[PDB]
Design an enzyme around this catalytic site. Sequence first.
Site, mmCIF file in Angstrom:
data_model
loop_
_atom_site.group_PDB
_atom_site.id
_atom_site.type_symbol
_atom_site.label_atom_id
_atom_site.label_comp_id
_atom_site.label_asym_id
_atom_site.label_seq_id
_atom_site.Cartn_x
_atom_site.Cartn_y
_atom_site.Cartn_z
ATOM 1 N N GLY A 271 2.037 6.052 10.390
ATOM 2 C CA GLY A 271 3.281 5.736 10.094
ATOM 3 C C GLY A 271 3.810 4.670 10.468
ATOM 4 O O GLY A 271 5.221 4.506 10.198
ATOM 5 N N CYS B 254 3.164 1.405 9.580
ATOM 6 C CA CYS B 254 2.873 0.253 8.783
ATOM 7 C C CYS B 254 4.488 -0.067 8.199
ATOM 8 O O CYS B 254 5.263 0.814 7.927
ATOM 9 C CB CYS B 254 2.196 0.762 7.411
ATOM 10 S SG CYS B 254 0.510 1.096 8.019
ATOM 11 N N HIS C 86 0.901 -1.322 -0.034
ATOM 12 C CA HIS C 86 -0.015 0.075 0.058
ATOM 13 C C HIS C 86 0.659 1.155 0.007
ATOM 14 O O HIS C 86 0.406 2.446 -0.255
ATOM 15 C CB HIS C 86 -1.089 0.004 1.044
ATOM 16 C CG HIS C 86 -0.854 0.239 2.505
ATOM 17 N ND1 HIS C 86 -0.021 1.260 3.036
ATOM 18 C CD2 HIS C 86 -1.019 -0.552 3.381
ATOM 19 C CE1 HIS C 86 0.111 0.892 4.433
ATOM 20 N NE2 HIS C 86 -0.587 -0.325 4.523
HETATM 21 O O1 LIG Z 1 -4.972 1.349 9.197
HETATM 22 C C1 LIG Z 1 -4.427 2.042 8.216
HETATM 23 C C2 LIG Z 1 -2.790 2.986 8.506
HETATM 24 N N1 LIG Z 1 -2.696 2.385 10.035
HETATM 25 N N2 LIG Z 1 -1.899 1.115 10.386
HETATM 26 N N3 LIG Z 1 -1.791 1.202 11.583
HETATM 27 C C3 LIG Z 1 -2.240 2.645 12.234
HETATM 28 C C4 LIG Z 1 -2.522 3.053 13.453
HETATM 29 C C5 LIG Z 1 -3.239 4.337 13.578
HETATM 30 C C6 LIG Z 1 -3.718 5.118 12.281
HETATM 31 C C7 LIG Z 1 -3.644 4.316 11.174
HETATM 32 C C8 LIG Z 1 -2.986 3.192 10.939
HETATM 33 N N4 LIG Z 1 -5.055 2.171 7.065
HETATM 34 C C9 LIG Z 1 -6.387 1.517 6.640
HETATM 35 C C10 LIG Z 1 -5.859 0.245 5.804
HETATM 36 C C11 LIG Z 1 -7.039 -0.619 5.266
HETATM 37 C C12 LIG Z 1 -6.411 -1.633 4.572
HETATM 38 S S1 LIG Z 1 -4.608 -1.809 4.671
HETATM 39 C C13 LIG Z 1 -4.724 -0.278 5.368
HETATM 40 C C14 LIG Z 1 -4.360 3.049 6.133
HETATM 41 C C15 LIG Z 1 -3.171 2.718 5.249
HETATM 42 C C16 LIG Z 1 -2.682 3.580 4.468
HETATM 43 C C17 LIG Z 1 -3.444 4.687 4.229
HETATM 44 C C18 LIG Z 1 -2.893 6.000 3.019
HETATM 45 C C19 LIG Z 1 -2.885 7.118 3.250
HETATM 46 C C20 LIG Z 1 -2.467 8.003 2.541
HETATM 47 C C21 LIG Z 1 -1.634 7.563 1.371
HETATM 48 N N5 LIG Z 1 -1.596 6.457 1.097
HETATM 49 C C22 LIG Z 1 -2.146 5.420 1.864
HETATM 50 C C23 LIG Z 1 -4.513 5.345 4.789
HETATM 51 C C24 LIG Z 1 -5.003 4.576 5.723
#
Ligand SMILES: O=C(Cn1nnc2ccccc21)N(Cc1ccsc1)c1ccc(-c2cccnc2)cc1
EC number: 3.4.19.12
Lengths: 306, 306
Positions: free
Chosen positions: A143, A145, A41
């Site tokens: 941040g 991931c 991602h």
């Molecule tokens: O869950 C996450 C990211 N993530 N991970 N651990 C977290 C803890 C606190 C807050 C957010 C957190 N997601 C949803 C998701 C659903 C399926 S796979 C990932 C998430 C991934 C990439 C983005 C993003 C934002 C901007 C640009 N590109 C990607 C936007 C969202």
Amino acid sequence: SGFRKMAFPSGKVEGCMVQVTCGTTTLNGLWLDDTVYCPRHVICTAEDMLNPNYEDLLIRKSNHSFLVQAGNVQLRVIGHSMQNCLLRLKVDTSNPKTPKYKFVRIQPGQTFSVLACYNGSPSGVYQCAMRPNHTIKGSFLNGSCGSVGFNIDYDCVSFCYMHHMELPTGVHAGTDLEGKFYGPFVDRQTAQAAGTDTTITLNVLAWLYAAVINGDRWFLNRFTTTLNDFNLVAMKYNYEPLTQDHVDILGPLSAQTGIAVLDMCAALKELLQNGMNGRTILGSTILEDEFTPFDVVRQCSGVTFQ
Amino acid sequence: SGFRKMAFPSGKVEGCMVQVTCGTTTLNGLWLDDTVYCPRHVICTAEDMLNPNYEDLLIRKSNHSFLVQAGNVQLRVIGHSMQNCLLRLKVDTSNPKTPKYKFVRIQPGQTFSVLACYNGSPSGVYQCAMRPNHTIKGSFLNGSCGSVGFNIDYDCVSFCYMHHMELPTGVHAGTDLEGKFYGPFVDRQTAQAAGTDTTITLNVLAWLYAAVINGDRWFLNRFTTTLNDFNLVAMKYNYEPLTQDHVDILGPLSAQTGIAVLDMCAALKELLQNGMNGRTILGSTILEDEFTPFDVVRQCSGVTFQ
Ligand SMILES: O=C(Cn1nnc2ccccc21)N(Cc1ccsc1)c1ccc(-c2cccnc2)cc1
Ligand SMILES: O=C(Cn1nnc2ccccc21)N(Cc1ccsc1)c1ccc(-c2cccnc2)cc1
């Protein structure tokens, strides 16, 4: 004496963490030999996450679409491929700090150390169980991931988790280092939610054994139980059914304490039915389920405090 | 989201651990630049521990009475001196992995990471509070003496604890890196025991703020309290008295959540009087006191889940 949620020393993993940037998106990667692993991602925009076709998004990138930073050093990407939900970036430099390592897919109920990272910089280390519902109750912010989970045995790092997402209940989902998700989750925006979870029965029994090794017997009783009579109570209290496989794994702790497994099961049945009567076990007022039998033997003395 | 007892990444400290042997006694030391620090009881026999005169035991040693092993490498000792309850061994080699470091004497209620070591090999890492009674509820077995406690800020390791002893209740005592004991303890066999302990009030309030940052408000109430009315309840429940200094430290968490400190004190007074009514806070059925206000700001989001 004492009993703590202990992580593995994180240094062998700290020397593998890097930052991966694709456009305006930055997250963490793992640098072993001349490959960097990171969540796929990383190639998405915020809007792409709603319905990404990763094959279609990736064919639009070159090697130079990716920047890898290891400390201050820029690594040049010379190759890229998708493997399930990870990207594998080939880089121009082999990591000189690469430890002896493997990739392992852990099973539900097993424990591992997490090194929380942000911008390729490690911030913290803590111990997690893989829940029966294939989530972990981690501590992660935006941040994080590409942060990794691992175990260490005799200087070999067994990498078992890479962080991808937070679910709506605040728990965490991710993949093995082949990029296969633990559980039914997918790296896109959907209505996906953590399934119902259960208490890890085997780990609760291991931790009762830990409390006896460390010199506490208050919760034992003069009863025994059958596996089936235990399981009828287990199901009432949302515990995993105990199996003969689980009884066999508890053999060594049984032998160290001289408490038969089913006699320890009778003790747990009485704890579940009566509660703890305001008492503690290894300092806890609840039954702990995030220590495996292996964790207990690693941490506790080989000599029971009789 | 999530909230875990998180340690600092241990790698900078792992690269400092060595084994120190004097006769038949082996324990851990810390190798920074060209000095190895270790407990002075390394120079004792089992019988010497009953009533050692360390000045008299040390004058009987040469530089070559000490062996230092760093991995497979033998370091040659070229100097030795006692500093309070530590030995300082000068060695022929500066540690190439020496991080930026300081020595700090931490205060009661403050937290630090412990790297449990055996035979100069790190086995585990976990987070400890210094209890108000100057002990830590660690997890240590025989061989763990010379294991160290530390904090990390921007790549500088602040070393604050070196492990010396287990007391009769199974808790742990040790020194700062100047070899001064935390608390009234001494490195000889006596009738010494952990004094009465208290709950770390400031940390309980920090952790209630953590639970509100992470989106939980169930335990708040429409009441306020004076500092003195709070302290009358605190004393009943074996909590440390809250001071104005403690109120001022909670300012930033107060500001992030918009809950006045004394309004959070009223919430804690109601939790102490009523209990938690079978509810949890950040997954806990008890009031946690091993997170400082600094820990909460390090780990939690800067954006409250309103
Ligand atoms: O869950 C996450 C990211 N993530 N991970 N651990 C977290 C803890 C606190 C807050 C957010 C957190 N997601 C949803 C998701 C659903 C399926 S796979 C990932 C998430 C991934 C990439 C983005 C993003 C934002 C901007 C640009 N590109 C990607 C936007 C969202
Ligand atoms: O507490 C300890 C050692 N220690 N530390 N953490 C532990 C956890 C589990 C078991 C033992 C542990 N003591 C008592 C003591 C009292 C004042 S200072 C140290 C201890 C030190 C050196 C010896 C010893 C044995 C043989 C030779 N030389 C020293 C014998 C005893």
